[PDB]
Each structure stands twice: as C-alpha cells, then as structure tokens.
Amino acid sequence: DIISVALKRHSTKAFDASKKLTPEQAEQIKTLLQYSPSSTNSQPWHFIVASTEEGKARVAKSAAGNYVFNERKMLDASHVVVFCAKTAMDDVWLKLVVDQEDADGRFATPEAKAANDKGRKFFADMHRKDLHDDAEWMAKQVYLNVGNFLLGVAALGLDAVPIEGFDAAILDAEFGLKEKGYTSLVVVPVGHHSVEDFNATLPKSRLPQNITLTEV
Amino acid sequence: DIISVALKRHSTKAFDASKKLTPEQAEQIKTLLQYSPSSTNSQPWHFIVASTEEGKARVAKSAAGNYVFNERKMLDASHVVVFCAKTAMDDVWLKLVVDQEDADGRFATPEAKAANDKGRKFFADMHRKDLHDDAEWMAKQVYLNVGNFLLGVAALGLDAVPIEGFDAAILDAEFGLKEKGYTSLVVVPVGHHSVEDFNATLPKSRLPQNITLTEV
Ligand SMILES: Cc1cc2nc3c(=O)[nH]c(=O)nc-3n(C[C@H](O)[C@H](O)[C@H](O)COP(=O)(O)O)c2cc1C
Numbered sequence: 001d002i003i004s005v006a007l008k009r010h011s012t013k014a015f016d017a018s019k020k021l022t023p024e025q026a027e028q029i030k031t032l033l034q035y036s037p038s039s040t041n042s043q044p045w046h047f048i049v050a051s052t053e054e055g056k057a058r059v060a061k062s063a064a065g066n067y068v069f070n071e072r073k074m075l076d077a078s079h080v081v082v083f084c085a086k087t088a089m090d091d092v093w094l095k096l097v098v099d100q101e102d103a104d105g106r107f108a109t110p111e112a113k114a115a116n117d118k119g120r121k122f123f124a125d126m127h128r129k130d131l132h133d134d135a136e137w138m139a140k141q142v143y144l145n146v147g148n149f150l151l152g153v154a155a156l157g158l159d160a161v162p163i164e165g166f167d168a169a170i171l172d173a174e175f176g177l178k179e180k181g182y183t184s185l186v187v188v189p190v191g192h193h194s195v196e197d198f199n200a201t202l203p204k205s206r207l208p209q210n211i212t213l214t215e216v
Numbered sequence: 217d218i219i220s221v222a223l224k225r226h227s228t229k230a231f232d233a234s235k236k237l238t239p240e241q242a243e244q245i246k247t248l249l250q251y252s253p254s255s256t257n258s259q260p261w262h263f264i265v266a267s268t269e270e271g272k273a274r275v276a277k278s279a280a281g282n283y284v285f286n287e288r289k290m291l292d293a294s295h296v297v298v299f300c301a302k303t304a305m306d307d308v309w310l311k312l313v314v315d316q317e318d319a320d321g322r323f324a325t326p327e328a329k330a331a332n333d334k335g336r337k338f339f340a341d342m343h344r345k346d347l348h349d350d351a352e353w354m355a356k357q358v359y360l361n362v363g364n365f366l367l368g369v370a371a372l373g374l375d376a377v378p379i380e381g382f383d384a385a386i387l388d389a390e391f392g393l394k395e396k397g398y399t400s401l402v403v404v405p406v407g408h409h410s411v412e413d414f415n416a417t418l419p420k421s422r423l424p425q426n427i428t429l430t431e432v
C-alpha cells in the first residue's frame with residue numbers, strides 16, 4: 001500500500017554505513033531517476049550517483065562550511081544522488097528529446113514528429129523569450145523528479161533524506177558543472193537508518209487540510 | 217512494485233467522465249497532497265480539489281487561448297487538483313508551521329522548538345532577504361509535491377496528467393488566489409482514461425542513462 005508508505009516515510013538524520021544497497025536496488029534507483037515525468041518530456045537534468053566512499057567524500061565537500069550537520073548523512077549512506085538542472089535550454093537538447101521519442105516509436109507519421117517538436121518549442125520559447133525564466137522552469141522539473149524519487153525509494157524499503165543544505169557553488173566546481181551546462185540543486189542520500197536517527201521514532205507533522213485545502 | 221508503476225504510468229490525454237474515484241480514493245489523494253515533504257516542512261502550498269461539474273468548469277476556464285487542448289482533461293476527469301504556491305513567505309506562516317510541530321509532539325524541550333524555528337528562519341531568510349528567489353523556492357516545493365502525487369495516484373490504480381498548459385491569471389482570478397496569497401502552478405486531473413487516449417498504448421520514451429547519469 002502506497003498511503004502507508006507516504007505516512008511512514010521520514011527524513012533520515014543518520015544512516016548505517018554497513019547496510020549497503022543490493023545490486024537490484026542500485027539499478028532500480030537509476031530507473032526512478034530516468035523515468036520521471038517532465039514538461040513536454042524535456043528532461044532538463046543530470047544525475048551524479050555516488051556509491052564509492054571516494055565519490056561520496058567528493059560530494060560531502062559541499063557541506064564542509066556552515067552545513068556540517070549534513071556531512072555525516074552523505075558519507076554513511078549507500079547511494080548518494082545529486083540532482084542537477086540545465087542552466088539553459090539549447091536547440092540540441094530539444095532535438096535529442098524528439099529524436100529519442102522517434103526512435104522509441106511514439107510517432108506514426110513524420111508530420112506528427114514535427115507537431116510534437118513545434119509544441120515543445122512553443123513551451124520552451126515561452127520560457128526563453130517571453131517569461132525569461134527557463135532556468136527556473138527547468139529546475140521546477142528537477143524538483144518534480146525529487147518528489148517522484150523520495151516516494152519511490154520509500155516504497156522500495158529504503159530510507160532517504162532530501163538535502164538543500166549544501167553549497168551549490170562548491171559542488172559545481174568539484175564535478176566540473178556550469179561549463180558542462182548544469183547546476184546542483186538537491187542531494188539525496190539513500191540507504192538504511194541506524195539507532196542514532198532522532199526522526200524515526202518521532203511522529204509526522206503536517207498542517208491540517210482545513211488551512212491548505214478547499215473542495216469545490 | 218513501484219518500479220512497475222513508474223514504468224507503466226503515463227500522462228493520459230483523454231478521460232472517461234463516468235469513471236469516478238471510489239470514496240476512499242478521494243480521501244487518499246488528499247492525504248498524498250498533505251503528507252508530502254518540503255524544505256524545513258515549510259509546506260508553502262494550497263490545493264483546490266474540484267470534484268463537481270460546476271467546480272471543474274471554473275478550473276477549465278484557464279484552458280483558453282492556445283491551451284484549448286487541455287479543456288477536455290479538466291472537465292472529463294473525476295477529480296481535478298490545482299497546485300498553488302504562496303506568493304510571499306510571511307513570519308505568521310512560519311509560526312503556524314512550528315506550532316503544528318509542537319502540538320504533534322516533535323519537541324521534548326522548549327529549547328528544541330526554538331532550535332527548529334531558528335533552522336527554518338535561516339533557510340527562509342536566505343531566500344527572502346539575500347537571494348530574493350522566495351517565490352521560486354516555494355514553487356520548487358510545490359513541484360516536489362506534484363512528483364510525489366503523480367507516482368502516488370499511479371500506485372493507487374488511477375490515471376493522471378500534470379498540466380502546465382493553462383492561463384495562471386484566469387485561474388487565480390477565478391478563485392481569488394492573489395488576495396489570499398497564492399498562485400496556481402500545476403493542474404492535475406485525476407481519474408481513469410478512455411479508449412481515445414493514444415498515450416495509453418504508446419511506449420514510454422526517455423533519454424539514455426549514458427547522457428543523463430554519471431556514476432562516481
Ligand atoms: C527540497 C527539500 C530540502 C530539504 N533540506 C533538508 C536539509 O538540508 N537537511 C535536513 O536534515 N532535512 C532537509 N529536508 C527534510 C525536511 O525537513 C522534511 O522533508 C520535512 O521536515 C518533512 O518531514 P518528513 O520528510 O519526515 O515528512 C528537506 C526536504 C526537502 C523536500
């Protein structure tokens with residue numbers, strides 16, 4: 001049951017370094033990252049999955065300043081994924097998406113391929129020329145990916161925690177992003193929790209539906 | 217189990233108006249909206265859940281102009297959820313968030329309630345006083361809610377489609393969201409697809425992992 005998973009999941013404050021992810025779960029984590037939906041299937045993202053202790057130590061360098069309380073989570077967890085968004089939407093990426101949709105057989109006639117590319121460009125240009133927020137629109141898609149991911153890993157029987165508490169500039173310089181056209185937004189350490197986790201015993205807190213919801 | 221859901225779920229292009237959500241599923245989707253995570257448990261959102269023919273007509277008014285291709289989805293779906301974000305993060309709302317965490321039993325000492333409030337304000341101030349990307353940071357959390365919701369409703373045996381193709385100005389004014397302190401971002405119709413949904417039989421297409429993923 002998925003509601004049980006939504007009510008029982010939590011943001012893990014401490015992981016067990018010994019409890020590693022099985023090769024099956026390690027593959028499944030990558031499937032969730034790839035198959036997440038996005039506006040017009042633009043998929044303006046990049047993922048860095050750190051499984052080695054040397055790779056996790058490289059990611060943990062972003063939380064070395066005033067974000068020290070987030071360092072231990074990034075090293076003790078089995079798999080650590082950093083979510084990156086595109087800095088700008090190029091015509092080459094819009095071409096890469098539609099050619100991949102064509103290779104997969106989503107279009108019957110080549111005219112339908114052009115109709116899809118036109119509609120995608122209509123949305124992409126509205127954000128590039130008119131609204132001037134392509135960087136925010138693409139980052140919004142990556143945040144949708146994080147939402148899909150957290151629920152997916154909680155349902156896989158794995159513990160995770162989303163981290164916004166890191167210096168993005170240090171993480172960009174450690175992996176050579178920006179020059180490659182990407183920016184780090186969220187870091188999600190995945191694995192299993194330990195007994196030092198002061199959040200697994202604590203109840204879940206959310207505002208009531210009378211304040212945040214209206215039915216019409 | 218959810219890997220199966222993530223690989224099988226799709227964006228429905230046509231719904232069946234007679235196929236309604238069971239009374240329990242209608243309560244389950246609302247739980248999914250609320251129990252979603254957000255940075256510092258800030259929950260900078262509001263949800264309008266349209267289930268009546270009159271309520272869905274009010275939402276469908278935003279599917280005008282070059283967004284006419286989304287009118288059917290908003291009217292034929294059983295339930296239509298409008299994801300809204302706060303326009304500005306006020307201090308009275310940050311107080312509402314900590315007081316709810318105090319009534320749920322997350323803090324043992326009053327020193328723990330003052331420590332979380334400080335930790336919330338550190339992040340809140342970094343976005344409203346320093347970076348000035350307050351509306352964008354809150355909008356990101358709302359998109360995180362959508363990702364959680366899409367995979368969530370898909371695991372419930374329901375069909376859905378996230379919509380960005382609508383007029384935010386029309387929707388906002390129709391529900392008077394601006395004066396209440398909110399803005400509409402994503403509209404998600406929930407129900408069951410009809411035989412006219414070409415996307416139900418079409419294969420899922422995503423970019424390969426050799427382009428979007430790097431293992432370290
Ligand atoms: C985008 C995002 C950023 C977050 N950043 C942090 C962080 O830097 N450190 C941390 O310990 N928790 C962080 N969290 C966890 C939240 O505090 C947590 O999701 C929220 O309190 C709700 O609790 P829950 O996850 O147990 O439901 C973040 C959550 C989200 C979704």
Ligand SMILES: Cc1cc2nc3c(=O)[nH]c(=O)nc-3n(C[C@H](O)[C@H](O)[C@H](O)COP(=O)(O)O)c2cc1C
Binds near residue numbers: 035037380420
């Ligand atoms: C934020 C967002 C906005 C979208 N807007 C629309 C829309 O206005 N109309 C539509 O038919 N599909 C829309 N989609 C559906 C995408 O095209 C779809 O997610 C993508 O093609 C991948 O296909 P899938 O969802 O079946 O995996 C949107 C998706 C997201 C996540």
Ligand SMILES: O=CC(=O)CNC(=O)c1cc(N(CCBr)CCBr)c([N+](=O)[O-])cc1[N+](=O)[O-]
Binds near residue numbers: 011257317335338
């Ligand atoms: O949900 C309320 C609480 O249970 C915990 N809140 C957080 O998840 C949370 C907690 C912290 N701190 C508190 C400053 Br001493 C670090 C200790 Br874990 C911070 N932070 O300041 O980085 C951010 C979030 N954050 O979410 O960004």
